[PDB]
């Protein structure tokens, strides 16, 4: 039987590079948005400044049921230093213009994320959500923001 919890294409490449963008990226061009795929081997995504107004954005191109998000940090291949997001908020949109921060109850959902730079932490949405665009918005981090990502659900 089919279950709506399959990887949507970060690791597989089904989500093409052009579908992945960010608010900003670190100025040396060694931590680009396209380095944010789960199990990516060369660093990860890092914004130009570490702040809670930065985000990594995925355009799924079609309305898609989203059921879970997995994240990693990353180890710098230059320094061996580890960076990871400890918590984040999710922003979603059907059209790329009207954005809503994901809530559980009256308040924004704060997802607890990584506690090292290497392991995958999976968070399920409290209900499946029909969306086209996804933004991961780091709120807290260790040493600095670095992300690798997979999205889970199913194409409706």
């Amino acid at each position: 039987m089919f279950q709506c919890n399959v990887p949507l294409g970060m690791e597989s490449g089904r989500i093409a590079n052009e579908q992945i963008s960010a608010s900003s990226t670190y100025s040396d061009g060694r931590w680009t948005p396209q380095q944010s795929r789960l199990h990516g081997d060369d660093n990860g995504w890092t914004p130009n400044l570490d702040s809670n107004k930065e985000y990594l954005q995925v355009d799924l191109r079609f309305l898609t049921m989203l059921t879970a998000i997995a994240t990693q940090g990353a180890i710098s291949r230059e320094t061996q230093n580890g960076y990871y997001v400890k918590s984040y908020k999710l922003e979603v949109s059907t059209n790329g213009e009207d954005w809503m921060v994901y809530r559980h109850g009256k308040n924004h959902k704060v997802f607890q994320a990584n506690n090292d730079a290497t392991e995958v932490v999976l968070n399920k949405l409290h209900a499946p959500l029909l969306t086209r665009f996804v933004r991961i918005r780091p709120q807290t981090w260790h040493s600095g923001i670095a992300l690798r990502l997979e999205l889970f659900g199913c194409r409706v």
């Binding site: 670190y26 040396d28 060694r30 130009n48 230059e78 320094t79 960076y83």
Partner: peptide, 4 residues
């Protein structure tokens, strides 16, 4: 900017 530094190298991380």
């Amino acid at each position: 900017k530094p190298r991380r």
